[PDB]
Design an enzyme around this catalytic site. Structure first.
Site, PDB file in Angstrom:
ATOM      1  CE1 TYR A 121      -2.937  -3.265   1.453  1.00 34.62           C
ATOM      2  CE2 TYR A 121      -1.815  -2.882   3.516  1.00 34.62           C
ATOM      3  CZ  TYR A 121      -2.648  -3.670   2.734  1.00 34.62           C
ATOM      4  OH  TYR A 121      -3.217  -4.861   3.215  1.00 34.62           O
TER       5      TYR A 121
HETATM    6  C1  SHT Z   1      -3.580   7.545   0.600  1.00 33.44           C
HETATM    7  C2  SHT Z   1      -3.478   6.049   0.794  1.00 33.44           C
HETATM    8  O1  SHT Z   1      -2.064   5.725   1.023  1.00 33.44           O
HETATM    9  P1  SHT Z   1      -0.971   5.501  -0.148  1.00 33.44           P
HETATM   10  O2  SHT Z   1      -0.986   6.782  -0.949  1.00 33.44           O
HETATM   11  O3  SHT Z   1       0.335   5.220   0.564  1.00 33.44           O
HETATM   12  O4  SHT Z   1      -1.486   4.320  -0.946  1.00 33.44           O
HETATM   13  C3  SHT Z   1      -4.359   5.592   1.971  1.00 33.44           C
HETATM   14  N1  SHT Z   1      -3.837   4.404   2.639  1.00 33.44           N
HETATM   15  C4  SHT Z   1      -3.267   3.348   2.005  1.00 33.44           C
HETATM   16  O5  SHT Z   1      -2.078   3.069   2.142  1.00 33.44           O
HETATM   17  C5  SHT Z   1      -4.101   2.586   1.231  1.00 33.44           C
HETATM   18  C6  SHT Z   1      -4.962   1.696   1.708  1.00 33.44           C
HETATM   19  C7  SHT Z   1      -5.170   1.335   3.148  1.00 33.44           C
HETATM   20  C8  SHT Z   1      -4.391   0.132   3.569  1.00 33.44           C
HETATM   21  C9  SHT Z   1      -4.206   0.026   5.070  1.00 33.44           C
HETATM   22  C10 SHT Z   1      -4.509  -1.372   5.587  1.00 33.44           C
HETATM   23  S1  SHT Z   1      -4.235  -1.586   7.368  1.00 33.44           S
HETATM   24  S2  SHT Z   1      -3.824  -3.556   7.521  1.00 33.44           S
HETATM   25  C11 SHT Z   1      -2.163  -3.704   6.808  1.00 33.44           C
HETATM   26  C12 SHT Z   1      -1.040  -3.437   7.789  1.00 33.44           C
HETATM   27  S3  SHT Z   1       0.563  -3.634   7.066  1.00 33.44           S
HETATM   28  O6  SHT Z   1       0.357  -4.026   5.700  1.00 33.44           O
HETATM   29  O7  SHT Z   1       1.143  -2.201   7.136  1.00 33.44           O
HETATM   30  O8  SHT Z   1       1.304  -4.515   7.921  1.00 33.44           O
HETATM   31  C13 SHT Z   1      -5.810   5.371   1.497  1.00 33.44           C
HETATM   32  O9  SHT Z   1      -5.998   5.228   0.275  1.00 33.44           O
HETATM   33  O10 SHT Z   1      -6.700   5.348   2.365  1.00 33.44           O
END
Ligand code: SHT
Ligand code: F43
Ligand code: TP7
Ligand code: COM
Lengths: 259, 550, 442, 442, 50, 51
Positions: free
Chosen positions: C366
């Protein structure tokens, strides 16, 4: 100069956290795992073969003249040009000697050029492969920071930091990287940190007795040392919170008089 | 005289189509239609059971419906008739699935991901590994969680329409891949079209992800891209096991799900504030590429008219009908372009005139050919309306006449010249000539873009210039009014049907929507709309397995 | 004057330049150099003539994998490129004593056009530059090569690309440092759009100059967002002076003192300097020792912590010679400082939050992209008001070619265009000179 | 310099001011008055102190019909208006002598603040004024009435209504002539987002002054959008000069000639004047005797038609004294002119189409409303590049009170605040003066 | 037109505001619903005193 | 005259309701379409909502 304290508190947990943060405190070593055995458990390279490179040595490559960039002495792994690898640990909530945020703070206080990441049930540090192996053997594995039962070098599937221990006092492992040898009472790593089996299991010592775990742990627990028994840490946390709030409201000397 | 629309007029109207007189007020009102009676019975049962006496449907209030004969509707090139109520996008599951299939499609290229895996991550990439990744993504895309029973997963029967497919311009890699989840360009397209598409695509590999319809039903269109990216990342880090660090994983994530992503539509700004994959962001060339009639037909008029029908059903009925206005909607506005063979007859006359005078593509786009072709087609269409009173009764609104005649003129001009902007210029000339002929046009404002069009057709200014393939519902002139966009898409398609082009704007979209696994087959949109109007279309997104039977 | 703060200015080599400089001499509202850089950023447009030629020759109008058969124009833009430049300058020209700089880049394949300020004095936003340049380019291309009336739309699509339908320049060959004002994270966020890689490439991978560029842009943006107004103006001015312009030589001093050190040693040196300078004092000594610390100067303590943050990033990323450590360094520098002194970190936890954002943005599946594409106009990195981005510039300057998002890959054209301006190539030196030119007016 | 055509200058009363004035003298790029108007429109902010007091007293924070019980503050902003204005001026002042002014309007019930230009020079856009004024107001209210630290959030919600959650100032008591950049429907449309009601209220319902204001704004916007560059510049220059400033007294002459006439009489007068001035000539005589006309000067004919359109709107909506005839008059002036002469309409049909959509949305259920709520940024009236809105302003000025969404209902704060500046209230007499100042420089 | 303008914007109450720009979403989406609005949606306040 | 209509079975959940804080107007209003504040809310809460 400035003589640094490292952590507030008077309990044994606060003292252990201070010891981990202190770079001049020599961690007590409790086992002897050979460098090749640590490399084998790490699972990145075959011991005896040369380190793979990501770029030519820093002398070969040409960089622009930068007085400020040249003030910092690079690591030997950087000087040669080695790939950046990682070592990951999972720590049990039941009196593991080292804990994720404590591990990250100690790593960033004691080691050069490291990338530390903290999760609730995970902690990983990334560095150049040679230096990473060096401080993995010297500090991470041979000292009191590691307990083969309550802690485990493991990538891939990490789960069991909040679960109860098994019949031998070992943290739960979904892949079973390390097993308990009842004949000798020692923990043996039958797989490397990502999960592929090892040709020869490596002895990582025997589990630390629970009495010693109570003394060397860095976690606060109701059954062990509770935070209510350490009001000094709570006061410092509340002071940090209030300072943050006052600075975010209006950052002046007058608004900080109510600190 | 023989006309293509004559048979439908014979079936729809009891009197002679050339007869100028009839009688009214003797049909019993809404009772003359079986659909209205079914609606009345359903309303009574629904009120009494579910609504606890709150009235829902009261035909007695408002206009007394059925003072005239409520005509049935043919569907062009299809020998089946349906009532006008069956063609409403809410009452027609075929139109809903037509929009669902477009909404839930994202195309992601997998060549940067493979290169990053091979070089940076130190992992070999082989056709066997690609097959393993395809298996992983097919399991994981709908709701799956790989080797994790403790994780919550979506019911498999709830996402039976979810697929992950692969296609590539590399022939050897194509035949080395599993045919279970491969879109074969060679066996889906004719030889020359397949060669052209392979040359345009190159030697690259692309994966098509069809997010389940229920996801788009519950959420909006911007959910599809995020769902696809998340599942692609999970499947990539599971199939290929990588012992590299996490920064390298971030670079791989960018290369795998944010480097070569192709979306169906763009986000809209200002008062049309919407996310991607909404019908207002789909360009006319993209919609022309979505429809696959160039695959199965060599007739340029039919190829343009299928795109006209799809564009009408999307833009006028769904997008402008509900997304922008709501209510009863604009069904009869779009159906006039694909119900009877009126537009078919007009477009065939335009093609015949162009072939007789200028040849199939025998002239460079000049003003004079635009004027003469558009004028001739408009005059023919208007006199056809004049001498067939039943035809004028069928197209009672001037908007459901202006649009049809102008679409015929634009298709003729695009045939003659092969330029889409020349075709739209002919459309605008046809509109003003229609206005002067009948002293009439569409609704109030309606011709905002037809008085502004002639100047904006060949303009070079920033907010006025665009090729017709690159225009869409967000084009400032086309933003609001009904009865244009669906025909603009057909004119854009006809610009390329004259040249025998394999695609219009995007080869990847053309290949992706040739997938046999789609619920709505875009080869014959008219036939599928006919099937949906007959309640014989199996749509997806139904929560039958999570609802009580009582 | 309203601020009694004085600073001593040091160059990038650690040599003293001037002493007792008023703090407002480096303010964006007073410094002539910052004004000039803002104006140049607003009025500078980069044109890719080779890209236009390639798009028109292959009919590649329309974006990612888009191509319109039959709409292909065979023109020689790179061959002409002096004619086209002259016509564009003639069209954009307003007066005779007028800027209207159009200059040839890479031997004809690129153009660096500077729209005159007269067209921007009567514009409510900066978007007039790109639109005027696109219109002038369209007219020049249509007139030089006798394009037919029915291909002007193709020329427009090649130059701008999907603009009426897609309210941006996606598949076009014209670019600027600032994005569309409708695509901002918040109001006043226009100036936080230059990524770290662009700043590094413009300064030619010079650590101090890249830091100065990023800090100047971020703090000018904070002044634009209304944040640095009233009681916050002093804190943002001190942050700019101590984190970007190396005031009192704190960054160089900390780096020199921790050449062989770690993040913890940098924290120790920062606390020692703050105690020695009177910035922080002892609040109280608890029962278990741990004499708490309170700031005698809150804004000055924040500035010292920011300078130490930059120094810690430099030390760690010069030890590793990799730019992947920035997030952890900032996060745990703030953590260690807070639980070492009982004091707030940089930006009162906003720096730590933005470091967490960096961590989860560049260290997982992510995660997305690397640290080189960090900018303040992103939902992940907007939270710190110009205190977490400038250290990333030092980190990327210290990288020994182990990043996929290297500056050479993502900012070659930007560097070639904006490296010609002296105030952009060496922001630190010219900002210092501009501050020196207005020393006596305070 | 590059345009050899001269124009005369007449005031709003039809009296001659000067002759042989070059066309470029009224250009946005040269006229000092237009530059001053654009600069001042970006820095002037309207503050509703009474609205702030009412919102805080009843806890009306949130927006439409929203109340938060418990978040109620009892302050006396209207009584302490002088102190609040002094504090805001102190906060916003840059050094000493900037153009920072906070005048008292309606006995302290309203505030008109002008942030200094130095705060906008280093700003990429115009949003700095509103954000800086909001922050200054928050600080002044906090330090005048000793508001608790836990109520600054309520104060912020009172001043700006939802801004972090809603990228706008909807429920707040702060306003400006220009809309938020997130509301723009296209690049360069910042100056087009001024509603007709705002322009009418600013000019105090003066027909000629409202025409001048709307035309100046629309043509300056066309310059900003890049539309009026190259070969398109002369058309917009003539459109501004003739439709907006009645250069040759064309508007007043046509209205005088059709005091008791209809739209067709105005069309006939326009054609007669165009023939007499040599702008149009007889192309050919058809078999039926129809005399097809061709323009000897295309842009001059466009300007003549636009002036006639304004005159026809004035005549019809003054005969009816109702502002609901605007769309029909704009449509049918062009509709009868085109088929009487064979010549294109005011904007080659672009204004007629704007009228066909204006008639749609001003007489139906699908949106729109009264003519006063439309603007150049509106999706319905954005299609004519500055040739359709000044007639709407004139007609709304001629209205006698038959519209529910009158300027009093819609623009009460904005109109009252912006009417205090002579440049905004009477743009005609100051644009003429600015042109006279630079008459001799061409 | 007066009725249409009133019902489209003057007197209308939306559950969630639009999110133009980066967020790119329309009105009545869960990202536009404020916390107080969702608190008012839940009706436990009128049926329970806890 | 001559419109198509949606199937009422697909819109059985579609309601248009009216509520008012004016008790006199709420008195002579059809209770079928009326959201009664007095009947759905306790006395104090109903008074607060009406105010
Ligand atoms: C802005 C975006 O982050 P990014 O630009 O780094 O993808 C933001 N968050 C993300 O990273 C994307 C998706 C959410 C995933 C979080 C899942 S929590 S469970 C995994 C925990 S670990 O993988 O870190 O161990 C979102 O789209 O809500
Ligand atoms: C009240 C309006 C104003 C407005 O904004 N829309 C109306 C009504 C609206 C309602 C019909 C509500 C209902 O069923 O009672 C809707 C469905 C829009 C909506 N979502 O509510 C609609 N029209 Ni209209 N509307 C249509 C049409 C038309 C044509 C009718 C031609 C003629 O015989 O006079 C004319 C325009 C004209 O000025 O010529 C027309 C007008 C009008 N239309 C005039 C006046 C109607 C009147 O008879 O009193 N519609 C048509 O031309 C056919 C398509 C049809 C649309 C529904 C469909 O496609 O089935 C419908 C589309
Ligand atoms: C003009 C504008 O209406 P508003 O006045 O902004 O509410 C706009 N309507 C439309 O686009 C209506 C399009 C569909 C109905 C008419 C089809 S002919 C919109 O909803 O944003
Ligand atoms: O005729 S109107 O323009 O009122 C609306 C057509 S449905």
């Amino acid at each position: 100069a400035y003589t640094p304290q490292f952590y507030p508190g008077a309990t044994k947990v606060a003292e252990n956290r201070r010891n981990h943060l202190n770079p001049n405190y020599e961690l007590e070593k409790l086992r002897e795992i050979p460098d090749e055995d640590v490399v084998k458990i790490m699972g990145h390279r075959q011991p005896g073969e040369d380190y793979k490179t990501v770029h030519p040595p820093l002398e070969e490559m040409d960089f622009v003249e930068d007085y400020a960039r040249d003030l910092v002495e690079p690591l030997n792994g950087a000087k040669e040009g080695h790939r950046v690898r990682y070592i990951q640990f999972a720590d049990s909530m039941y009196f593991a000697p080292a804990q994720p945020y404590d591990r990250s703070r100690s790593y960033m206080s004691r080691l050069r050029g490291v990338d530390a990441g903290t999760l609730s049930g995970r902690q990983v540090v990334e560095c150049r492969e040679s230096d990473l192996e060096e401080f993995s053997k010297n500090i991470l594995m041979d000292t009191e920071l590691f307990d083969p039962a309550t802690s485990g070098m493991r990538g891939a599937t990490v789960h069991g930091h909040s679960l109860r221990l098994d019949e031998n006092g070992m943290m739960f492992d979904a892949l079973q990287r390390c097993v308990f040898d009842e004949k000798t009472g020692h923990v043996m790593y039958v797989k490397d940190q990502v999960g592929k089996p090892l040709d020869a299991p490596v002895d990582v010592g025997e589990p630390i007795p629970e009495a010693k775990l109570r003394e060397i742990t860095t976690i606060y627990r109701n059954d062990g040392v509770a935070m209510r028994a350490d009001p000094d840490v709570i006061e410092v946390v509340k002071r940090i919170h209030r300072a943050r709030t006052l600075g975010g409201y209006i950052p002046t000397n007058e608004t900080f008089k109510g600190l | 005289e023989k006309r293509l629309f004559l048979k439908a007029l014979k079936e729809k109207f009891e009197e002679d189509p050339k007869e100028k007189y009839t009688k009214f007020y003797t049909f019993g009102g809404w009772e003359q239609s079986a659909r209205k009676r079914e609606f009345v019975e359903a309303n009574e049962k629904i009120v009494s059971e579910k609504r606890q006496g709150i009235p829902l449907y009261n035909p007695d209030i408002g206009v007394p419906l059925g003072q005239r004969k409520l005509m049935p509707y043919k569907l062009s090139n299809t020998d089946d008739y349906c009532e006008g109520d069956d063609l409403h996008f809410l009452n027609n599951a075929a139109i809903q699935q037509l929009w669902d299939d477009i909404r839930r499609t994202v195309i992601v290229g997998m060549d940067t991901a493979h290169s990053v895996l091979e070089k940076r991550l130190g992992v070999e990439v082989t056709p066997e590994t690609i097959n393993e990744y395809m298996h992983t993504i097919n399991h994981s895309l709908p709701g799956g969680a790989v080797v994790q029973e403790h994780m919550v997963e979506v019911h498999p029967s709830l996402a039976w329409d979810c697929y992950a497919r692969i296609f590539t311009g590399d022939d050897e890699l194509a035949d080395e891949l599993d045919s279970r989840f491969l879109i074969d360009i060679n066996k889906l397209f004719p030889e020359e079209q397949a060669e052209t598409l392979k040359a345009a695509i190159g030697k690259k590999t692309y994966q098509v992800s069809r997010v389940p319809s229920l996801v788009g039903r519950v959420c909006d269109g911007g959910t599809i891209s995020r769902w696809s990216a998340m599942q692609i990342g999970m499947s990539f880090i599971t199939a290929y096991k990588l012992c590299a660090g996490e920064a390298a994983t971030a670079d791989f994530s960018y290369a795998s799900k944010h480097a070569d992503v192709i979306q169906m539509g763009n986000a809209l700004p200002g008062r049309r504030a919407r996310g991607p994959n909404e019908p207002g962001g789909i360009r006319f060339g993209i919609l022309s590429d979505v429809v696959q009639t160039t695959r199965v037909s060599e007739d340029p008029v039919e190829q343009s008219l299928e795109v006209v029908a799809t564009g009408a059903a999307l833009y006028d009925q769904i997008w402008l009908g509900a997304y922008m206005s709501g209510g009863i909607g604009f069904t009869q506005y779009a159906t006039a372009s694909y119900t009877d063979d009126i537009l078919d007859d007009f477009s065939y006359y335009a093609l015949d005139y162009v072939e007789k005078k200028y040849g199939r593509m025998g002239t460079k786009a000049t003003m004079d050919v635009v004027e003469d072709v558009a004028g001739e087609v408009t005059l023919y269409a208007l006199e056809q309306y004049d001498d067939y009173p039943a035809l004028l009764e069928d197209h009672f609104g001037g908007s459901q006449r202006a649009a049809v005649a102008a679409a015929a003129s634009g298709i003729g001009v695009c045939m003659a010249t092969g330029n889409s902007n020349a075709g739209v210029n002919g459309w605008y000339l046809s509109q003003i000539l229609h206005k002067e002929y009948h002293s009439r046009l569409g609704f109030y404002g309606y011709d905002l873009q037809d008085q502004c069009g002639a100047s904006n057709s060949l303009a070079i200014r920033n907010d006025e210039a665009a090729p017709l393939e690159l225009r869409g519902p967000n084009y400032p002139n086309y933003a609001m009014n009904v009865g244009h966009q669906g025909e603009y898409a057909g004119i854009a398609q006809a610009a390329h049907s004259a040249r025998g082009d394999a695609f219009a704007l995007n080869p990847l979209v053309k290949v992706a929507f040739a997938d046999p696994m789609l619920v709505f087959d875009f080869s014959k949109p008219r036939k599928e709309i006919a099937r949906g109007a007959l309640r014989e279309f199996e749509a997806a997104g139904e929560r039958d397995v999570i609802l009580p039977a009582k | 004057v309203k601020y009694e703060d004085k600073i001593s200015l040091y160059d990038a080599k650690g040599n003293l330049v001037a002493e007792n400089v008023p703090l407002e001499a480096i303010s964006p509202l007073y410094n002539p150099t910052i004004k000039s850089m803002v104006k140049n950023i607003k009025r500078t447009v980069a044109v890719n003539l080779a890209g236009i030629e390639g798009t028109l020759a292959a009919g590649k109008i329309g974006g990612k994998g888009c191509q319109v058969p039959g709409r292909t124009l065979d023109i020689s833009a790179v061959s002409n490129a002096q004619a086209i430049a002259d016509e564009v300058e003639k069209i954009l020209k307003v007066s005779e004593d007028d800027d209207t700089a159009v200059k040839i880049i890479n031997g004809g394949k690129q153009l660096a056009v500077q729209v005159p300020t007269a067209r921007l004095e009567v514009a409510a936003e900066y978007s007039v530059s790109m639109l005027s340049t696109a219109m002038a380019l369209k007219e020049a291309l249509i007139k030089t090569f006798n394009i037919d009336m029915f291909d002007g739309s193709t020329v427009h699509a090649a130059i701008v690309g999907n603009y009426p339908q897609v309210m941006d320049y996606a598949g076009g060959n014209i670019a600027s440092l600032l994005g569309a004002p409708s695509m901002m994270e918040g109001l006043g966020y226009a100036l936080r759009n230059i990524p770290v890689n662009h700043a590094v490439a413009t300064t030619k991978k010079n650590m101090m100059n890249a830091i100065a560029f990023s800090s100047v842009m971020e703090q000018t943006a904070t002044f634009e967002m209304g944040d640095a107004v009233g009681s916050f103006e002093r804190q943002h001015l001190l942050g700019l002076a101590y984190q970007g312009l190396n005031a009192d030589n704190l960054v160089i001093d900390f780096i020199k003192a921790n050449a062989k050190g770690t993040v913890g040693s940098v924290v120790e040196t920062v606390i020692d300097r703050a105690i020695a300078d009177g910035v922080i004092v002892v609040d109280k000594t608890m029962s278990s020792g741990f004499n708490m610390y309170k700031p005698a100067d809150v804004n000055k303590w924040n500035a010292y912590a920011a300078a130490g943050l930059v120094a810690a990033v430099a030390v760690s990323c010069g030890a590793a010679r990799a730019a992947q450590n920035v997030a952890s360094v900032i996060l745990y520098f703030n953590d260690i400082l807070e639980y070492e002194t009982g004091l707030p970190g940089v930006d009162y936890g906003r720096s730590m939050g933005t470091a967490v954002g960096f961590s989860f943005f560049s260290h997982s599946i992510y995660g997305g992209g690397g640290p080189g594409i960090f900018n303040g106009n992103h939902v992940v990195t907007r939270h710190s008001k110009g205190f977490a981005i400038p250290p990333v510039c030092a980190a990327m300057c210290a990288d020994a070619g182990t990043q996929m998002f290297s500056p050479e890959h993502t900012s070659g054209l930007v560097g070639s265009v904006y490296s010609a301006f002296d105030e952009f190539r060496e922001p630190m030196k010219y900002v210092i000179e501009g501050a020196l030119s207005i020393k006596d007016q305070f």
